[PDB]
Design a protein around this ligand. Sequence first.
Ligand SMILES: OC[C@H]1[C@@H]2[C@@H](O)[C@H](O)[C@@H](CO)N2C[C@@H]1O[C@H]1O[C@H](CO)[C@@H](O)[C@H](O)[C@H]1O
Ligand SMILES: OC[C@H]1[C@@H]2[C@@H](O)[C@H](O)[C@@H](CO)N2C[C@@H]1O[C@H]1O[C@H](CO)[C@@H](O)[C@H](O)[C@H]1O
Lengths: 503, 503
Amino acid sequence: TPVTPQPPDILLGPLFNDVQNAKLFPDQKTFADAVPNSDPLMILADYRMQQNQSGFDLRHFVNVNFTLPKKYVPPEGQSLREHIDGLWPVLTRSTENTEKWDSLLPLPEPYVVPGGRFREVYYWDSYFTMLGLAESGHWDKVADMVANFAHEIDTYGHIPNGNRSYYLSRSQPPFFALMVELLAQHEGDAALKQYLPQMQKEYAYWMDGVENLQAGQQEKRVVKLQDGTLLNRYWDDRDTPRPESWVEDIATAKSNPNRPATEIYRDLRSAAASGWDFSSRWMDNPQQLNTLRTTSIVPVDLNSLMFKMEKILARASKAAGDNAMANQYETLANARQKGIEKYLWNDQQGWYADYDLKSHKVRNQLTAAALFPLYVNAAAKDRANKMATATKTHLLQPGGLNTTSVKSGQQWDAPNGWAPLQWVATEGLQNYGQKEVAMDISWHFLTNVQHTYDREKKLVEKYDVSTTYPLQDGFGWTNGVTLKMLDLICPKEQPCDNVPATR
Amino acid sequence: ETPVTPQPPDILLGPLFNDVQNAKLFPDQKTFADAVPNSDPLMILADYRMQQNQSGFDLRHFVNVNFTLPKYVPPEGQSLREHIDGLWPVLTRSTENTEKWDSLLPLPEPYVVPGGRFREVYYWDSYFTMLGLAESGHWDKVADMVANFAHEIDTYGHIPNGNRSYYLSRSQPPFFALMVELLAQHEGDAALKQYLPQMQKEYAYWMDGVENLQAGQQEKRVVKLQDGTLLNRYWDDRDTPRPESWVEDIATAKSNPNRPATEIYRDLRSAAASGWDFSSRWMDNPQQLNTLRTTSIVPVDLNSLMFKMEKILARASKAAGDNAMANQYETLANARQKGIEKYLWNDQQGWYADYDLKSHKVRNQLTAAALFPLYVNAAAKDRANKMATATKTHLLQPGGLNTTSVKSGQQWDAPNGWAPLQWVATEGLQNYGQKEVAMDISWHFLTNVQHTYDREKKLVEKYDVSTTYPLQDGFGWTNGVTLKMLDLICPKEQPCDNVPATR
Ligand SMILES: OC[C@H]1[C@@H]2[C@@H](O)[C@H](O)[C@@H](CO)N2C[C@@H]1O[C@H]1O[C@H](CO)[C@@H](O)[C@H](O)[C@H]1O
Ligand SMILES: OC[C@H]1[C@@H]2[C@@H](O)[C@H](O)[C@@H](CO)N2C[C@@H]1O[C@H]1O[C@H](CO)[C@@H](O)[C@H](O)[C@H]1O
């Protein structure tokens, strides 16, 4: 019997809703990750029967019908570098077969997870994680992960936000082609050839529907502007509350009776697809999450990543010996680059930004997403220079690169600094010889990382850059980026294992 | 690892699907939607892209190589009844195993298909088909079919329009509960007890999201009116062209640049979910299919079936010995009946009708859907007597019951007569003692059916009632309804095998 993976709200019906609303567990993700002990359809029937009988106890019912999700001790005195290098096994999972009905989706090879409540692989986190794995010589683990993503492309049609049934309805910022280039650093062109069809199938997922799409319209993850410019947006195929944030999403939508709930759920999910759940970047009112409108906003990071995909597809086509095909992908990438420079650059403010599909204007706000055009080498040299200035002036802080300069109360905003954006900014700036700002981001963020390591003996998911669910530890992309920056800031011939206290 | 069910062909194959359909290599768009890929679609897409980048690429040859297309002499002298009874094995499929990428979905038990291009099981057709199977003693097949539908509810969460990957995003008019009751006629309460959990799970699919829906809003298949009244609508979870009608749907949306294509696609798919694809019933302008707005219309047929589902759920609960649960279901059914009498009855005109979410008013048009509240015994007697009058004056025709009185050019409109509606109308009228009208419909429709049989020796999907893709032959529901009607119109001790020439 083939399986058709269904998310927990669908599998369990209102029992899911009831358990989440009762908040039997302090994290909504906990019950999303419960494994039913038997056919969920029969559990549901048993539940209706038991509610209509005498002394029913929901907590007792759950305990007998579900299995729920289940402390690293390093040797003493490790440097920052040793600590990170020793954590890889702790963050590695091997889940080749899962119980029927489990929300965790099987994967053929071992994979590194972020840490803490994140007990599954994450699409964009993995790239940054794999950079650290590659840096420390764990190439089997890098190849394992590229294989896992290729397998998901093959089985599902795309790479899901992560390997959970409740993540299938969306993807995440697309780094798979970049992971294939990373593997190519170790295996050579062989990597490009090995994964060309999977890269092409991913691209087709992102571009699905494009060829029948009329100008001025959108569908799924594609937009076609009035002049025919083709760009992508983040989109989730569902319009209901996220199982893993069930009560929160319902509260968010209920707090705004001015919009149908379904529209708000779709925008929340699509912001989860963007990786930036959540951010003033998406909101009409920077202090009210319930005003977000992610699907009406064309993201400049996503589109930089799509240019990069198209450029890598050209390189892999060529390596496969398909020259005419490589030229087709170059032509595609050239158009993407024109689209970015016209529609994703704000000439009044002097920086890259998202495009607004409601107002048909470039948006005003500067965020760390504005560095992606540099990261992918799509940007004009003159605009890269302006981005260095914008960065120095508005985003660089003592503890690293600020996500935005808006303190909204949300995670993807001031004062939060996120490792992936530190690295994207650093690499972006270096691409255009802006070494000083690059180095400032790197030193500032590392100093922040080392400080928390000294005091707490750990690394965490994000950092407050104003000085150098609860906060989670581990932590995949922080670890990977820390290794890359460490190497960057000390000479190649005399590497440091902790951030030097004096620059 | 357990194999996953494939995506629909458009998603599976990428732009190759779109290309093959646009080229109209086959005269039926459904043909390529039913193509079996000979290897992994991921590799086929890559091969396609590569070969397009060469001289003399031939699309048709590429399809011939990479896909396999889908693949009766009765004894002489059969009466109409004997012909039908001999055809059951001809229309019966056994497909316990399918190739991993076939759009055909596996089923564990044999099943009767409608005929012709309908090479898969259909949700609502199957009920009328199973009535015929039951009448001619084929209870094994009835049980096979109920088991199949219970299995789909278990694996997918609902019964799809049919067992095809491109039907998974929608259901059909819900008859599963009535199929269980049919089987209960032979088995007794054993059937209700056995399938109670699957009936409950189908109900949860129809009502999914209801717990958190605010008054005045809709979501998926549920609507909640401003006074809190709960009703259902037809809904498809996708908003793209139907693979099996690809070019038609694209042309339809293209001809109305006043609406986003995705909304039109969602409304086309939702009409397919209603079984009435297509009809003036859903359309603002009857010569523009592109003006249909299915998802903004509360259907009186669907909501009658929902009432009947609730009634059957109470009856099954009682048979399983849970009296309090049974009373809960009775209460829901009572609420549904009030909803129907209030929002799905047009008192100005004196007939049942759909409710319009856009204008907040009961609609004016009389269609054969209006007999549904009689069929499920939801209607007040005085309203049933009015329906008999309405039926005589507007719908009854020499060749049977007209679907509507509007000759739009669409299939579910004058002058087309469809077997399921003949039977729904006949039984509903009989439920309220309106014997004369019910017999007229039966004699008139049967005479139509007999004459096509006399001339062409076949039964077909629909009939022109003004007198007694191309037209399909078989035909499951026509065969089922004809057996029930033949038994109805002749004395028990003088059964007929052909419709008598003189009533
Ligand atoms: O802002 C918190 C995000 C952040 C993502 O950017 C990372 O991909 C991920 C793990 O490091 N991460 C946690 C959170 O996203 C995940 O968790 C939420 C629920 O808390 C999911 O809804 C989201 O889809 C998932 O990526
Ligand atoms: O009027 C055409 C409908 C009619 C449905 O009411 C029946 O369920 C079905 C088979 O007898 N039937 C043919 C057609 O619907 C089917 O075919 C179309 C494409 O031609 C699909 O889009 C539709 O989903 C499917 O039910």
